[PDB]
């Protein structure tokens, strides 16, 4: 369950800026 | 935090505040690794040159926080620590060598939609994510200018390649430290600052969709300084002593 | 700065 969170991950929802974190994995 | 924003609620659920009871004060952040144990800086608990070292019922712990100053009435846990470990090898006397400790609570925290474990990682997520360029993102209380703000803050960062981290300071860089930050041409900005230390640096894996602890806000030449960077002691590295301590 | 805490706790 680490990790995951109740108001993003579990609901499936992103934050506004994870986007960045992701775009920047190569 | 230096140029970042106001986090979103539940954004970072593992965020937890170093509290003093007398004076009352913000002493560091933290971050929740399972519903007992809690990871800081060895910093945030001893620092012998500035008379610095807290025991045990100098604090408080207080977890699902959104607000800096307030007593969130039905959304934070406040716990008392049963113990503190610090790391056996930290180096306090010449560069923060291993920054890190371990807090065990008296009692057990109950997780809810504001307080949720953050994983530690493993040999091979520390492999794939802790490279040049990629972002991971620091939370903290701490403050805004090298200045209080009102709710939790967060900014992402860029990792930095060795060898500038090590062409940017005098200090002695080890293999338990990585650094974060833009380069003064990138043209953009933050870092962590005074209050952040002992806070999580996350990563979000792109393989499984989970967040990752990869550092501790460790230390830093100012905030937010042109051609300097915030060190952070490396999790990955000291993996084998967190196993340890939990395990014994 | 800080409001107060619940003694509950100190
Ligand atoms: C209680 C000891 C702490 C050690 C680390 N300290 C810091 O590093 C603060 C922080 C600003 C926050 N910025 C940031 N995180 N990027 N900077 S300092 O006051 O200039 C500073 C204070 C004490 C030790 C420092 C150090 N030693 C380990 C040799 C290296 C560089 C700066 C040090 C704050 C005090």
């Known amino acids: ?26 | 935090i230096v140029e970042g924003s106001d986090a979103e609620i539940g954004m970072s659920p593992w965020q937890v505040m170093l509290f003093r009871k007398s004076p009352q004060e913000l002493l560091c952040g933290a971050s929740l690794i399972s519903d007992r144990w809690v990871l800081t800086a060895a910093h945030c608990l001893l620092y012998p040159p500035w008379d610095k070292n807290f025991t045990e019922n100098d604090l408080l712990v207080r977890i699902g926080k959104h607000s800096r100053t307030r007593y969130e009435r039905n959304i934070e846990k406040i716990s008392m620590l049963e113990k503190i470990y610090i790391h056996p090898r930290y180096n306090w006397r010449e560069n923060l060598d291993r920054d890190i400790a371990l807090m065990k609570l008296k009692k057990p925290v109950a997780f809810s939609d504001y307080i949720h474990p953050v994983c530690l990682p493993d040999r091979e997520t520390a492999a794939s994510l802790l490279q040049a360029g990629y972002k991971g993102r620091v939370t903290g209380w701490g403050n805004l200018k090298e200045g209080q703000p009102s709710v939790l803050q967060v900014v992402n960062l860029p990792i930095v390649e060795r060898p500038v981290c090590k062409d940017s300071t005098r200090i002695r860089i080890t293999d338990n430290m990585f650094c974060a930050g833009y380069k003064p041409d990138e043209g953009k900005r933050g870092d962590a600052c005074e209050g952040d230390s002992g806070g999580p640096f996350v990563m979000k894996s792109p393989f499984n969709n989970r967040w990752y602890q990869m550092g501790i806000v460790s230390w830093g030449e100012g905030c937010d300084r042109d051609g300097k960077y915030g060190f952070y002691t490396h999790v990955f590295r000291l993996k084998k002593w967190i196993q340890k301590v939990i395990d014994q | 700065d800080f409001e107060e805490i619940p003694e509950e706790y100190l």
């Open chain 1, 1 to 26: 369950d680490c990790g995951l969170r109740p108001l993003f991950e579990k609901k499936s929802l992103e934050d506004k800026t994870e986007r960045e974190l992701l775009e920047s994995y190569i």
